[PDB]
């Protein structure tokens, strides 16, 4: 009976959870803690009170930092922001759980943006839709990389995955803001910005290695990722009939090598053989021009 | 310059592109575990006898539960480095850890979208999202504490109480989630059945822990390989500690820390549990006491 009593108290109450415990499972997340400027610039247009902007901001940082914990497991990364990745320190298991834990903490902050039922309903739908999109882009990015060469994505395919994957968070922040704006839509512009952002990340990952084997590590090659330059090189070589080059590119990616000279041979293949690096640079300026060269404010 | 801008223009002005083919690719890890219910759907069907939801609504709740459950297994298996799930090879060993994690997470939000099709009644919908959000936070708290104890062993040796609060959260979360949504949707229903569903969740987990050691002794006893702080183990470790049985307490710990697949060694542990601590007999008596609170609930305190 003393057991059955202690048990009756257990089941007739909320599940117990201390802050000691909160601390123990937040380890992976706190470690990565060791944007915004953008949210501020856009708010000049949305005019959200500071209190509400703060929450939108905490929400995005929670989803973002969490994404990195996961992406680093998925991409098998050893370094983020210059430190060892959380999963290498605390393990893949805790990191997955903590990161997924944070997704829901973020969802939980949404009920603090409003007390109005209809408005709340739209913030949840937005949250849910963009998260579904983020996983869709990420899903494809991982599939192409891991089942290569089952699928050699074209430039258009890569661009759509980028819309979902990177455009996803950009759109979630904006759409939340537009829905809260007490005050055309900026989504298209934010979509373009996300694309510019992802192709630039892809680009610099290799450029900061071709210039200094101590500026970047061209980790993307190690991961075997189908970056923008890589997608350009694989299609270019197939189209120009460069079978050997096409195949050597695949081989190097499939190796998942940390060899600096092998990574540098691939970067130079993109440099002189396929001109993927020039192509990517020029593609980035063109995308930026669409913006800088918009006097009619269509963006 | 000009045709490339035309295409980028079309691209950024449209919703993100997604095909049915892409959906198949992203679902492979999921559809793979589907080849594994009429016992999860059974309890839902019986409980509806008390909640009386319109069938199609009941189907949605149902679909939501298959998604969360199945996706949780995809992740638990990665998290527990399990080679087998219900007989076949786990998805992460076939499709890889990356796709598996992502596909399971993708399903979490798919399940969340289903929730907003259970009703459009603004008030009610908020209670459904709160419930969903609340139980997923709890499930993750339980899961995180179970993983922590296992991966940090022997830093913290949980007590029985501790193991039970962890269970309320972990396993009880999906049970409560289902129940609470059903109850909030109910058109009818007496006292809340959460307490009963909580007790049901505890029985289920401990039963799971017990059977995993007992099906081996009679089941590969994977829980030993994983180094999991199960109910019998939590009992063996505290019992031995309390009896100042130093060398057995340590031998238990050495074996769990071996993360071994050696049947001889897994057996050496099961025997410490039978002959030294009697943890298996003790776990058995515990499940029985828990079930008796149900079989002897003439007052209908927990039962409907
Ligand atoms: C926002 C959110 C909750 C997302 C959940 C799904 C998820 C893990 C998305 C990945 C987000 C992302 C763009 C990571 C970095 O991309 P990358 O692969 O190029 O990695 P890098 O930043 O190191 O270049
Ligand atoms: C419901 C949901 C969305 C969950 C997501 C988070 C997650 C990984 C939950 C696992 C829940 C659970 C009790 C799994 C099995 O327990 P176990 O560790 O004893 O493993 P086993 O049941 O295979 O023996
Ligand atoms: Mg990455
Ligand atoms: Mg990535
Ligand atoms: Mg498990
Ligand atoms: Mg587990």
Swiss-Prot record, chain A:
Dimethylallyl diphosphate binds at residues 80, 165-166, 198, 205, 215, 225. Keywords: Carotenoid biosynthesis, Cytoplasm, Isoprene biosynthesis, Magnesium, Metal-binding, Protein transport, Transferase, Transport. Its main location: cytoplasm. InterPro entries: Isoprenoid_synthase_dom_sf, Polyprenyl_synt, Polyprenyl_synt_CS. It catalyses: isopentenyl diphosphate + dimethylallyl diphosphate = (2E)-geranyl diphosphate + diphosphate; isopentenyl diphosphate + (2E)-geranyl diphosphate = (2E,6E)-farnesyl diphosphate + diphosphate; isopentenyl diphosphate + (2E,6E)-farnesyl diphosphate = (2E,6E,10E)-geranylgeranyl diphosphate + diphosphate. Pfam families: polyprenyl_synt (PF00348). One of its GO terms (cellular component) is mitochondrion. Disulfide bonds: none annotated. Pathway: Isoprenoid biosynthesis; farnesyl diphosphate biosynthesis; farnesyl diphosphate from geranyl diphosphate and isopentenyl diphosphate: step 1/1; Isoprenoid biosynthesis; geranyl diphosphate biosynthesis; geranyl diphosphate from dimethylallyl diphosphate and isopentenyl diphosphate: step 1/1; Isoprenoid biosynthesis; geranylgeranyl diphosphate biosynthesis; geranylgeranyl diphosphate from farnesyl diphosphate and isopentenyl diphosphate: step 1/1. The keyword 4Fe-4S does not apply. GO terms for biological process: farnesyl diphosphate biosynthetic process; geranyl diphosphate biosynthetic process; geranylgeranyl diphosphate biosynthetic process; isoprenoid biosynthetic process; protein transport; terpenoid biosynthetic process. Mg(2+) 2 binds at residues 71, 75. CDD domains: Trans_IPPS_HT. It is found in: Cytoplasm. Belongs to the FPP/GGPP synthase family. Catalyzes the trans-addition of the 3 molecules of IPP onto DMAPP to form geranylgeranyl pyrophosphate. Required for the membrane attachment of YPT1 and SEC4. May be involved in vesicle trafficking and protein sorting. Present with 2840 molecules/cell in log phase SD medium. This is Geranylgeranyl pyrophosphate synthase BTS1.
